[PDB]
PDB file of C-alpha atoms and ligand atoms in Angstrom:
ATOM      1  CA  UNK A   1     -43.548 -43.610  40.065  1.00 10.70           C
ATOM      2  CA  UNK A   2     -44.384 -45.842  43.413  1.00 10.59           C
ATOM      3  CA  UNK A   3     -42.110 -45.984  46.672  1.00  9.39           C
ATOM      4  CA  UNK A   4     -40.793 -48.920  46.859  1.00  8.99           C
ATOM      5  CA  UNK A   5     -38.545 -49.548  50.147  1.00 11.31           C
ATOM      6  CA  UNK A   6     -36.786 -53.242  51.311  1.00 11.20           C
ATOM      7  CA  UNK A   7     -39.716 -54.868  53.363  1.00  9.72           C
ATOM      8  CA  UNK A   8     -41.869 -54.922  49.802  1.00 11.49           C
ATOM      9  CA  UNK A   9     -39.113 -57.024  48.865  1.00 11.07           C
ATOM     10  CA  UNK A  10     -38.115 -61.170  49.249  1.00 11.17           C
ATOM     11  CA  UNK A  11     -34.750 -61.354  48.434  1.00  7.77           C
ATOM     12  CA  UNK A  12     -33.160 -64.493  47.659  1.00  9.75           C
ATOM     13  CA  UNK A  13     -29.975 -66.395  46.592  1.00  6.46           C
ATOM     14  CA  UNK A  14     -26.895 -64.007  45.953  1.00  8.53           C
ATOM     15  CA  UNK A  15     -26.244 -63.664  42.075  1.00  7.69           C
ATOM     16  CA  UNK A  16     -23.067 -61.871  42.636  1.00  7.89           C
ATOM     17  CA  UNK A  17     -20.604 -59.455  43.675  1.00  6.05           C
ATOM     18  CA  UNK A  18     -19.884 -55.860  42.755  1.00  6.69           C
ATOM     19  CA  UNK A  19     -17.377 -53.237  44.063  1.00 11.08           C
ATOM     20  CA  UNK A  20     -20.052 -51.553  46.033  1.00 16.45           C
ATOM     21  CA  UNK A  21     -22.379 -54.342  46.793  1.00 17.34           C
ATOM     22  CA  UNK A  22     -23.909 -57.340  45.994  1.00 16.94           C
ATOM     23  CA  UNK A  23     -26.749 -58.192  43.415  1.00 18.56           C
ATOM     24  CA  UNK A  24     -29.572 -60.653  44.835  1.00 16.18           C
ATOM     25  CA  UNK A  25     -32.947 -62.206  43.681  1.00 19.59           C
ATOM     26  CA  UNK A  26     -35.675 -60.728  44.651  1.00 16.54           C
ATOM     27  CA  UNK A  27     -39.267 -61.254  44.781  1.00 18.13           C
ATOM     28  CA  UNK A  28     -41.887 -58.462  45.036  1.00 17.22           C
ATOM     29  CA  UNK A  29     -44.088 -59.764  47.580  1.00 15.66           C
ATOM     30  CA  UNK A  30     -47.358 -58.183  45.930  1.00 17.79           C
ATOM     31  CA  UNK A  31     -47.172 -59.243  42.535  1.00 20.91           C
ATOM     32  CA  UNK A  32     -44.703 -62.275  42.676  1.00 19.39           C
ATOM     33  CA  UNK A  33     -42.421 -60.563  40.173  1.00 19.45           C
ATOM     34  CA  UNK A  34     -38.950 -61.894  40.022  1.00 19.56           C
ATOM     35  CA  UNK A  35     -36.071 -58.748  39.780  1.00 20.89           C
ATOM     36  CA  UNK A  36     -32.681 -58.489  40.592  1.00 21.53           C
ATOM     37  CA  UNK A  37     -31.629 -55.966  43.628  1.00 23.44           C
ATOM     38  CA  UNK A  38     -28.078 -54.482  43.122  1.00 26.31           C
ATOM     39  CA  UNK A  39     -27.225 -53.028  46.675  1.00 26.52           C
ATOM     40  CA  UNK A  40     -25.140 -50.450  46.481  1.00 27.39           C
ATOM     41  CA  UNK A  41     -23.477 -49.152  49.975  1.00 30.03           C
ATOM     42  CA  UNK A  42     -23.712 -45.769  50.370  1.00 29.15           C
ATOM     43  CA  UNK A  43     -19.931 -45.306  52.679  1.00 25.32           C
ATOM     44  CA  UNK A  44     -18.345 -47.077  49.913  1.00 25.89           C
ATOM     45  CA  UNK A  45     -19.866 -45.174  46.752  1.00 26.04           C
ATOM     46  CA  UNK A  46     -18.927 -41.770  48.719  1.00 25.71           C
ATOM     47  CA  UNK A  47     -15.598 -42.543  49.839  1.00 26.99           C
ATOM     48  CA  UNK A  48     -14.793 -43.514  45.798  1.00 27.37           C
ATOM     49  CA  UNK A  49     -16.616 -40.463  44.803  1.00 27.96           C
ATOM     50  CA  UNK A  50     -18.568 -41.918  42.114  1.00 30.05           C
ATOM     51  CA  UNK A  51     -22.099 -41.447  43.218  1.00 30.67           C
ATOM     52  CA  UNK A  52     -22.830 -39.415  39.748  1.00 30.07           C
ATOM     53  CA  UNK A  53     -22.178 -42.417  38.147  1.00 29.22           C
ATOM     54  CA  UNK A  54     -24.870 -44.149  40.208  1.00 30.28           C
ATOM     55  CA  UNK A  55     -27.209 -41.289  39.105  1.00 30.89           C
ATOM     56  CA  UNK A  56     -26.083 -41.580  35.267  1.00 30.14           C
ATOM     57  CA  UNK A  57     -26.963 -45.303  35.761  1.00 29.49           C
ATOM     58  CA  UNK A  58     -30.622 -44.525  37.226  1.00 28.81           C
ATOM     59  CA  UNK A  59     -31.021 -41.616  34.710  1.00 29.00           C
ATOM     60  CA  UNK A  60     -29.774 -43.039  31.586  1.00 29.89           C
ATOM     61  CA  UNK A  61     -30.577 -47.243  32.073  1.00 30.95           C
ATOM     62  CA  UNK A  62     -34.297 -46.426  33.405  1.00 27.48           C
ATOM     63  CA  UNK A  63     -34.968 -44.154  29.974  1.00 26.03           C
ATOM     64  CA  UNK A  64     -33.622 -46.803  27.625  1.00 22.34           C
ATOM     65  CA  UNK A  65     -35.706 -49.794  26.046  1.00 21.09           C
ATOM     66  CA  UNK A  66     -34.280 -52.321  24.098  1.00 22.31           C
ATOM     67  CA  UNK A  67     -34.519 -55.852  24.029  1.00 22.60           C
ATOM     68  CA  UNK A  68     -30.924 -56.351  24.463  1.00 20.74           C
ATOM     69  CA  UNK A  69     -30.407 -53.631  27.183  1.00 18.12           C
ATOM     70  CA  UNK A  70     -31.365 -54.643  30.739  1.00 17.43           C
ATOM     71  CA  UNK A  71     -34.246 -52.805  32.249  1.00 13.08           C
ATOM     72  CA  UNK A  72     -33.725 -50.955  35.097  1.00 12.14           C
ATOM     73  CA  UNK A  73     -37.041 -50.319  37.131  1.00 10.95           C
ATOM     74  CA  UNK A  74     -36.225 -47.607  39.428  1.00  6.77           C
ATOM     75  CA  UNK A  75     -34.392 -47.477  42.771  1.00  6.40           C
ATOM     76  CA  UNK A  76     -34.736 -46.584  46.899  1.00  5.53           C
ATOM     77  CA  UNK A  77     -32.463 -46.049  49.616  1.00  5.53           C
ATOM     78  CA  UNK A  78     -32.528 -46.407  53.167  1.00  3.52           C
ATOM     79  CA  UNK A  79     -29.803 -45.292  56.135  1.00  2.53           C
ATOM     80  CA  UNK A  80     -26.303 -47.251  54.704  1.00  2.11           C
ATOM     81  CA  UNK A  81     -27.549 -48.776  50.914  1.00  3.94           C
ATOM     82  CA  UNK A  82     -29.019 -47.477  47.548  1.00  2.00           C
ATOM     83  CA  UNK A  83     -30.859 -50.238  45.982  1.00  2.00           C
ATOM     84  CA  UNK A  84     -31.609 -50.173  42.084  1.00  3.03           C
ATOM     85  CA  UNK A  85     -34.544 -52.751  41.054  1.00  2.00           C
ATOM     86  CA  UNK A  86     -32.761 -54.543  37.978  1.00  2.00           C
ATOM     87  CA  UNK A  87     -34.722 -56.748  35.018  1.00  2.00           C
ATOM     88  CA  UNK A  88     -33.467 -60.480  36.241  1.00  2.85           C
ATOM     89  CA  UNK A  89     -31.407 -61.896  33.688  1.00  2.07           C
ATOM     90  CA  UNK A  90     -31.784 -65.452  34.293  1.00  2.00           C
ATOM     91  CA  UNK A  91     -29.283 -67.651  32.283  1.00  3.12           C
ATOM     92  CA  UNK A  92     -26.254 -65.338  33.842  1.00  5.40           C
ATOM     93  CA  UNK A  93     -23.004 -63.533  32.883  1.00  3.42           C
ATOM     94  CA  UNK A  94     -21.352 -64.249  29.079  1.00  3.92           C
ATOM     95  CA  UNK A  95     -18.332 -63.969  31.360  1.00  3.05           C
ATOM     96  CA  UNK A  96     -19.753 -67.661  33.429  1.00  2.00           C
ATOM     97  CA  UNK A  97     -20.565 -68.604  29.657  1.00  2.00           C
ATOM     98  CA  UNK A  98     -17.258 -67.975  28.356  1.00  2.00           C
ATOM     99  CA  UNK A  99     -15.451 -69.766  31.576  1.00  2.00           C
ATOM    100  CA  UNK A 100     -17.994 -72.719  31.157  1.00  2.03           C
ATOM    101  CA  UNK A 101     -17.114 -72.809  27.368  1.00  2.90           C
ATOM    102  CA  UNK A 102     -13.827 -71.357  27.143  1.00  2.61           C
ATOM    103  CA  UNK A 103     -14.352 -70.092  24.021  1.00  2.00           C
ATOM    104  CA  UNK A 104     -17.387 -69.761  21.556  1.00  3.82           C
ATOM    105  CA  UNK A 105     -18.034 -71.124  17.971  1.00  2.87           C
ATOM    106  CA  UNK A 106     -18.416 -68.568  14.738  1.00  4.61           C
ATOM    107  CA  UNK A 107     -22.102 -68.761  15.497  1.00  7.38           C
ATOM    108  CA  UNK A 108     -22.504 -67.680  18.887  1.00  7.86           C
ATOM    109  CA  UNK A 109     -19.791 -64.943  18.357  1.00  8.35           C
ATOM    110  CA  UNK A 110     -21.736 -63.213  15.455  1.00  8.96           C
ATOM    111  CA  UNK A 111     -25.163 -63.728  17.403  1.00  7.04           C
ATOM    112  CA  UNK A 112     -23.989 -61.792  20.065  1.00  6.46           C
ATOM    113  CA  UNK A 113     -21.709 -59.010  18.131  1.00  8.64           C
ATOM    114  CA  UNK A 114     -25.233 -58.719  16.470  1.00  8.17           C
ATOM    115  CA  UNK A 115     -27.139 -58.238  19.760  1.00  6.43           C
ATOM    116  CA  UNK A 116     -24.512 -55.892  20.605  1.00  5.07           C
ATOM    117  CA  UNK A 117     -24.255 -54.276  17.768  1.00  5.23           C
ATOM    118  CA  UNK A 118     -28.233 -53.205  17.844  1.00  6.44           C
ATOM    119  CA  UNK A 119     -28.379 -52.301  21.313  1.00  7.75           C
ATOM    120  CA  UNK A 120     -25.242 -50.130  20.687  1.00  9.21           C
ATOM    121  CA  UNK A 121     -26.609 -48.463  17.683  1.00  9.71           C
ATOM    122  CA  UNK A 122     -30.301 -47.708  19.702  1.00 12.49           C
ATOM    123  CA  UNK A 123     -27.993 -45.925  22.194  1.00 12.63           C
ATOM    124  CA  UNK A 124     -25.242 -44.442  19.910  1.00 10.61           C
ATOM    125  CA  UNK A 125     -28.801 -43.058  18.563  1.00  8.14           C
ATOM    126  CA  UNK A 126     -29.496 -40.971  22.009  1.00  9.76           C
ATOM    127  CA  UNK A 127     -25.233 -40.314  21.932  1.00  6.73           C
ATOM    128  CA  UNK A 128     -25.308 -42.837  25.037  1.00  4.41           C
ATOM    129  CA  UNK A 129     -21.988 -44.121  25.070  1.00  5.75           C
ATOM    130  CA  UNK A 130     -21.509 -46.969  27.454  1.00  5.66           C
ATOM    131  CA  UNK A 131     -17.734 -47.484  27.938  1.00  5.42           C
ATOM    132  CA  UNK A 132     -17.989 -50.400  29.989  1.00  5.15           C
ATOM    133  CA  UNK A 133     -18.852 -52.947  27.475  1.00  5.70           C
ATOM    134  CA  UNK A 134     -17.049 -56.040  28.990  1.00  7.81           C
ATOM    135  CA  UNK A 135     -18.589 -59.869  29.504  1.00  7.26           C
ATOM    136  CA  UNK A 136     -19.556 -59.086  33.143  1.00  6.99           C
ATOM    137  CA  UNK A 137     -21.510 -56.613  32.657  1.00  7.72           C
ATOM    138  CA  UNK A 138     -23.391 -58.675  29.463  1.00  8.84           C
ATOM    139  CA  UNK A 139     -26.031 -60.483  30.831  1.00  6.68           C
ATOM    140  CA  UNK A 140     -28.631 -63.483  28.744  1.00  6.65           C
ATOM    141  CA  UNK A 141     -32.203 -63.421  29.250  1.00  5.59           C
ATOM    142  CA  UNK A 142     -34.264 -66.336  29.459  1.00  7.82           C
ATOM    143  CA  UNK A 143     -33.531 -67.163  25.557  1.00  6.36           C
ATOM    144  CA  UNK A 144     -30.152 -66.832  25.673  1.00  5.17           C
ATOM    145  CA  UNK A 145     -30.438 -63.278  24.127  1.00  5.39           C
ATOM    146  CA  UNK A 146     -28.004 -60.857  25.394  1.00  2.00           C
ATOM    147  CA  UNK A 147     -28.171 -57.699  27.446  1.00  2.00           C
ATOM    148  CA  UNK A 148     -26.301 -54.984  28.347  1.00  2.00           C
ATOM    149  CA  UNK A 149     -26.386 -53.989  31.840  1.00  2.00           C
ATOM    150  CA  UNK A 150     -24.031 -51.965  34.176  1.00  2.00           C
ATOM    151  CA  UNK A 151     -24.384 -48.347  32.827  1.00  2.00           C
ATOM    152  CA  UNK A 152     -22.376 -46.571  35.578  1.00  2.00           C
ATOM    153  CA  UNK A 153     -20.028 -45.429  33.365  1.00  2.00           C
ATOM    154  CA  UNK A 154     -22.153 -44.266  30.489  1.00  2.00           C
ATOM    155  CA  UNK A 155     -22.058 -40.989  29.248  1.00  2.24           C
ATOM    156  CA  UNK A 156     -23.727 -38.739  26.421  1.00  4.81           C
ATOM    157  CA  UNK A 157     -20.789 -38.419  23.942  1.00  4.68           C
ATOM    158  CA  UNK A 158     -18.315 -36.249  23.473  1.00  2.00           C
ATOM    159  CA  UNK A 159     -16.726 -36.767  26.666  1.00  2.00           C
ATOM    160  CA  UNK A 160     -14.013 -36.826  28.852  1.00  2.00           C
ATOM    161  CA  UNK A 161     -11.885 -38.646  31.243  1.00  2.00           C
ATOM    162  CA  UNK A 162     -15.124 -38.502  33.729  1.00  2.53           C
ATOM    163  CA  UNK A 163     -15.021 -40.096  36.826  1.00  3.74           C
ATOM    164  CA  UNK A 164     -11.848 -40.993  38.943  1.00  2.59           C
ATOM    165  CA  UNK A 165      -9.443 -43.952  37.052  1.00  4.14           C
ATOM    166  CA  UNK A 166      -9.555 -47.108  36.470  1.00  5.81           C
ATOM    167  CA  UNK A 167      -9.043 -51.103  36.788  1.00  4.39           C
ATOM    168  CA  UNK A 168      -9.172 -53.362  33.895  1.00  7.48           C
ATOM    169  CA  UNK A 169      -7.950 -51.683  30.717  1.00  7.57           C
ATOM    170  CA  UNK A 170      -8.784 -54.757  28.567  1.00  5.48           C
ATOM    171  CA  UNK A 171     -11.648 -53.154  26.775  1.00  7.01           C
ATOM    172  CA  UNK A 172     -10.814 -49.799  26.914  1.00  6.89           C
ATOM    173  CA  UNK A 173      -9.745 -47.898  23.350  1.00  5.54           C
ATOM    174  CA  UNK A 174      -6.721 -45.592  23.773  1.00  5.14           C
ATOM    175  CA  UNK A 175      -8.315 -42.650  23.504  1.00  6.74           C
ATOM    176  CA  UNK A 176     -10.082 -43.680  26.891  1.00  8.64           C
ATOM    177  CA  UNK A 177      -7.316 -44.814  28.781  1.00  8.93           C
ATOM    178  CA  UNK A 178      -5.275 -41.992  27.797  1.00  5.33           C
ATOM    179  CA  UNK A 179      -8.032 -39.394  29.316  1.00  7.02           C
ATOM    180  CA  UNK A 180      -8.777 -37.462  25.801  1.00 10.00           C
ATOM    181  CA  UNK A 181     -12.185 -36.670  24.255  1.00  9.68           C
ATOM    182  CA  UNK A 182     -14.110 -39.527  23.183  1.00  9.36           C
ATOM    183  CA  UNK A 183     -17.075 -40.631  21.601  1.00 11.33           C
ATOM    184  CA  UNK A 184     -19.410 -43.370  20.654  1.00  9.53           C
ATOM    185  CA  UNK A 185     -16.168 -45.209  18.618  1.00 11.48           C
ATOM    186  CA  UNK A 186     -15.523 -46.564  22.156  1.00 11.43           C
ATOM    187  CA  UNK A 187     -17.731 -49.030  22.215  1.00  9.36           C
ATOM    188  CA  UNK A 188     -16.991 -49.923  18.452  1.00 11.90           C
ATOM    189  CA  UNK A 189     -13.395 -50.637  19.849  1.00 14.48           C
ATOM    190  CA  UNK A 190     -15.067 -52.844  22.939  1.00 15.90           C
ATOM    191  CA  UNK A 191     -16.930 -54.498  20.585  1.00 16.74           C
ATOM    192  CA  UNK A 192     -13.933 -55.421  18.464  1.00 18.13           C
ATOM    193  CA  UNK A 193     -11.888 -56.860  21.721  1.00 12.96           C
ATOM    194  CA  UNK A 194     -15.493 -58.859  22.535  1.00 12.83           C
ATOM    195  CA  UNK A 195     -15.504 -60.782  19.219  1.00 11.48           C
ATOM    196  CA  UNK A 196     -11.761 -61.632  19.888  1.00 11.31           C
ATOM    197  CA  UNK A 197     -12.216 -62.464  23.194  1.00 11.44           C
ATOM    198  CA  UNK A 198     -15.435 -64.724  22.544  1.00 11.54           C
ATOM    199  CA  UNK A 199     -13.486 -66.558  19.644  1.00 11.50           C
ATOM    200  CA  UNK A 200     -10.283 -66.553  21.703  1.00 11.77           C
ATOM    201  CA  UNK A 201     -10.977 -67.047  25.171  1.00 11.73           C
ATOM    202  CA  UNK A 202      -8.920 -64.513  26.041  1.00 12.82           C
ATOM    203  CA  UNK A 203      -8.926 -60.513  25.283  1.00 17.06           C
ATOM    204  CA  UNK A 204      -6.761 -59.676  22.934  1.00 16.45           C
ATOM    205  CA  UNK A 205      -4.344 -57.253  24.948  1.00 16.18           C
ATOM    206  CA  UNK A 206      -4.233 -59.493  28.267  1.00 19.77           C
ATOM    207  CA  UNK A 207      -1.058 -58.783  30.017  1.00 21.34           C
ATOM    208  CA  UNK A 208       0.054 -59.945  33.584  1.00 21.90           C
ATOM    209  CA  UNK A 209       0.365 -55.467  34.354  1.00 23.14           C
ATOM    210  CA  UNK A 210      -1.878 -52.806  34.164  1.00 21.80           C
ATOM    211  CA  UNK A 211       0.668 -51.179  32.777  1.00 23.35           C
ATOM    212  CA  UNK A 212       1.924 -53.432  30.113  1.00 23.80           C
ATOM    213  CA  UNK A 213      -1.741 -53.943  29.086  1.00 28.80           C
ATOM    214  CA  UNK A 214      -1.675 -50.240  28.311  1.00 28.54           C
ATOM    215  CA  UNK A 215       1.118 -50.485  26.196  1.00 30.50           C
ATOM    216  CA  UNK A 216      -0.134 -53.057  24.260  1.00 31.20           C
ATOM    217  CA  UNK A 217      -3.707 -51.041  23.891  1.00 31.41           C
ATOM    218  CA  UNK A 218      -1.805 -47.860  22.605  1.00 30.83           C
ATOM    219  CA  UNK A 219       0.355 -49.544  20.095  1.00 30.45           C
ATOM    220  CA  UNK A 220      -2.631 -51.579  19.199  1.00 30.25           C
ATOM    221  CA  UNK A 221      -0.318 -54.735  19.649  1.00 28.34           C
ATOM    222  CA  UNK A 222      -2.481 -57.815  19.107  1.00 30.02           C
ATOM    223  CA  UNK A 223      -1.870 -61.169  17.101  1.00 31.26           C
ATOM    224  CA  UNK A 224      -4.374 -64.009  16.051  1.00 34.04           C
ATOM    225  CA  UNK A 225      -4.361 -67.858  16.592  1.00 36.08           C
ATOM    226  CA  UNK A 226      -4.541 -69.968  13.273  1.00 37.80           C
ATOM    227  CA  UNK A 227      -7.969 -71.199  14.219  1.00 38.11           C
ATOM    228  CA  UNK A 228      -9.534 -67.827  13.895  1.00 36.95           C
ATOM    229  CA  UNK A 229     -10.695 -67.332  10.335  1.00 38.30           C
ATOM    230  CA  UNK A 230     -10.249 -64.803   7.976  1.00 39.90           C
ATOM    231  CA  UNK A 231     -13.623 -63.054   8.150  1.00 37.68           C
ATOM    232  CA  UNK A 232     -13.300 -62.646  11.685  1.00 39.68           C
ATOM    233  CA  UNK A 233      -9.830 -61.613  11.611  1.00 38.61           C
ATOM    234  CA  UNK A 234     -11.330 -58.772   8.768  1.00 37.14           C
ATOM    235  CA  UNK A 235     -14.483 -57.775  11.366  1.00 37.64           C
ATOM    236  CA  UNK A 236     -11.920 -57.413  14.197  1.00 43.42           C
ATOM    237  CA  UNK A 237      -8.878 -55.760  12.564  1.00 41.42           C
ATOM    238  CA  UNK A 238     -11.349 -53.005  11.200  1.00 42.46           C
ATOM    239  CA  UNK A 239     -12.622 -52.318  14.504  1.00 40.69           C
ATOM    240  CA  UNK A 240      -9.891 -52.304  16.425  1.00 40.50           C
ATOM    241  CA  UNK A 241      -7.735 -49.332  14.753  1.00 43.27           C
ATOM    242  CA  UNK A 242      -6.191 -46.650  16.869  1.00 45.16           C
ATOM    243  CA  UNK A 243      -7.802 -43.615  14.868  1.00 44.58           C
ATOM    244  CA  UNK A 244     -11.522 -43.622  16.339  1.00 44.71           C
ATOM    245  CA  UNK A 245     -12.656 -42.163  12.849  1.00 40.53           C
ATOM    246  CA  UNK A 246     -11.082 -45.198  11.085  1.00 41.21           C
ATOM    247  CA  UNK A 247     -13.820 -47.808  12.882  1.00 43.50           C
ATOM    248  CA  UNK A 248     -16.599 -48.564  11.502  1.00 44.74           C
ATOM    249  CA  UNK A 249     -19.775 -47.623  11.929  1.00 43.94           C
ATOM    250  CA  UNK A 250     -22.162 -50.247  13.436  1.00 44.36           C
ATOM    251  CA  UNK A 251     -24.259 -50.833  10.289  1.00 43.67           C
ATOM    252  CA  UNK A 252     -21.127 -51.757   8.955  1.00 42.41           C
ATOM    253  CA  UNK A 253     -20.764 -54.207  11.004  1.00 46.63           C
ATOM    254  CA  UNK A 254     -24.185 -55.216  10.984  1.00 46.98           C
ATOM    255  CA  UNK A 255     -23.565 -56.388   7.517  1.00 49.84           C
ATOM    256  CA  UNK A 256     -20.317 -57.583   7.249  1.00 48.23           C
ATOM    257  CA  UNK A 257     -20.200 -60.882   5.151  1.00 47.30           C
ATOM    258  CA  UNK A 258     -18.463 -62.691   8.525  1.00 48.75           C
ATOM    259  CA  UNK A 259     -21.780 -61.457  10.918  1.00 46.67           C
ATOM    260  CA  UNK A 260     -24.033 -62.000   8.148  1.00 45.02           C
ATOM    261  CA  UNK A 261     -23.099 -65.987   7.029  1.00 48.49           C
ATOM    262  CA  UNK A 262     -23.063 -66.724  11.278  1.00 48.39           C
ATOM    263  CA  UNK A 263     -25.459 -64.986  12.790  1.00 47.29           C
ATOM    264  CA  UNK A 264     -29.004 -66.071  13.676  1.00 45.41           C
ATOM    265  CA  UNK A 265     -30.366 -62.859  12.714  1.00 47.55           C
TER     266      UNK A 265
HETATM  267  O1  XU1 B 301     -27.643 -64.664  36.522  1.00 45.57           O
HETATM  268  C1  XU1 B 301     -27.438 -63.473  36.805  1.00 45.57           C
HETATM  269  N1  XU1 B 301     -28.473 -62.694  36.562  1.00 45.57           N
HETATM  270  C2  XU1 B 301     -28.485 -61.403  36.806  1.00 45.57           C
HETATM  271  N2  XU1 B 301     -29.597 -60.706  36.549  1.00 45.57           N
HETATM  272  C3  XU1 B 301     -29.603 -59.398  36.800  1.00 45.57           C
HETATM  273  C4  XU1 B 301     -28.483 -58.782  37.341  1.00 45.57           C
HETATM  274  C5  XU1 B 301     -27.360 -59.481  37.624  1.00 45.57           C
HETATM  275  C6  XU1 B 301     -27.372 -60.812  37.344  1.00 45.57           C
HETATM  276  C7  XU1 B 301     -26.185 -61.584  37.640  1.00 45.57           C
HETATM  277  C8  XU1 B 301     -25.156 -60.877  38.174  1.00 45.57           C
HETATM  278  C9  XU1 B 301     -24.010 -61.647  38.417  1.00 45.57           C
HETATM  279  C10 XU1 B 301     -23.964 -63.038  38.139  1.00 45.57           C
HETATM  280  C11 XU1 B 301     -25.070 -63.698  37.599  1.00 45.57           C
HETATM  281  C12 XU1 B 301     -26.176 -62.929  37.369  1.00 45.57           C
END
């Protein structure tokens, strides 16, 4: 492996904010190579009692390689921070792209369910579930391909309610939110309220409560806008369907006529 510790380390301009810490630009001051450092403090992660997600993360993102899965390079800690050495993802968040844009045509939409899709099935493949499949934590590489980062709350499937509770429900299935077993049809669901959401500008159970949000996730309470044609309304009403068996599986989707006529391969 190889020690790595701050001082090897340039850091630079702030890319964002976390719960537990910022992420910043770094520079490794041997070979030049530009990362990302997510700092995690070490009070904070304690006090929440989530620090085995933080070793899922290392465990589980550091074993994976996919194009369309951002690399995690290993990690180091000193007195009050853990430090993981991220796989720079230079054109941003789909989140900052979706703000920019508002919302995105047929052909970005079924580009990226694609991505998705193929980074999903390499882990569904290992029973890596992710769970946390939301735009901030999809990230675009310097072609504009997508990644999937942020895999403190994966999991190998079946699972349960594992960790503490939660925050946004948008893109959580019921199953989840409701604490029973679960498996890889989670992210299947996710990726169901993503292709809304990147047609829509807006996820399809949004809800000024937590609570009424949850409501509208159990009952499975969404409608469409006219604009939003009838393939996509097809792609998104098969994956989002209470009964976890009932979703497809992601070769389905893969080839669905809607994904196949928009996507760029
Ligand atoms: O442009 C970004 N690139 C990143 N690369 C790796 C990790 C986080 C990021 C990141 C995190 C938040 C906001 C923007 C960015």
């Amino acid at each position: 492996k190889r020690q790595w510790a701050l001082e090897d380390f340039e850091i630079g301009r702030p890319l964002g904010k976390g719960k537990f810490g910022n992420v910043y630009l770094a520079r490794e001051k041997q070979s030049k190579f530009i990362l990302a450092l997510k700092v995690l403090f070490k009070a904070q992660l304690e006090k929440a009692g989530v620090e085995h997600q933080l070793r899922r993360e290392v465990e589980i993102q550091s074993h994976l390689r996919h194009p369309n899965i951002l690399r995690l390079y290993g990690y180091f800690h000193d007195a009050t921070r853990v430090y993981l050495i991220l796989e720079y993802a230079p054109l941003g968040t789909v989140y900052r792209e979706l703000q920019k844009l508002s919302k995105f045509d047929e052909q970005r939409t079924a580009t990226y369910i694609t991505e998705l899709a193929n980074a999903l099935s390499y882990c569904h493949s290992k029973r890596v579930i992710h769970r946390d499949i939301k735009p901030e934590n999809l990230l675009l590489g310097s072609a504009g391909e997508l990644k999937i980062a942020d895999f403190g709350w994966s999991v190998h499937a079946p699972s349960s309610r594992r960790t503490t509770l939660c925050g946004t429900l948008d893109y959580l299935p019921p199953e989840m939110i409701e604490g029973r077993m679960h498996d890889e049809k989670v992210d299947l669901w996710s990726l169901g309220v993503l292709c809304y959401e990147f047609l829509v500008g807006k996820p399809p159970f949004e809800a000024n409560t937590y609570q009424e949000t949850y409501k509208r996730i159990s009952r499975v309470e969404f409608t469409f806008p006219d604009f939003v044609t009838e393939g996509a309304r097809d792609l998104i009403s098969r994956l989002l369907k209470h009964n976890p068996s009932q979703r497809p599986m992601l070769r389905e989707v893969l080839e669905h006529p809607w994904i196949t006529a928009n996507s760029s391969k």
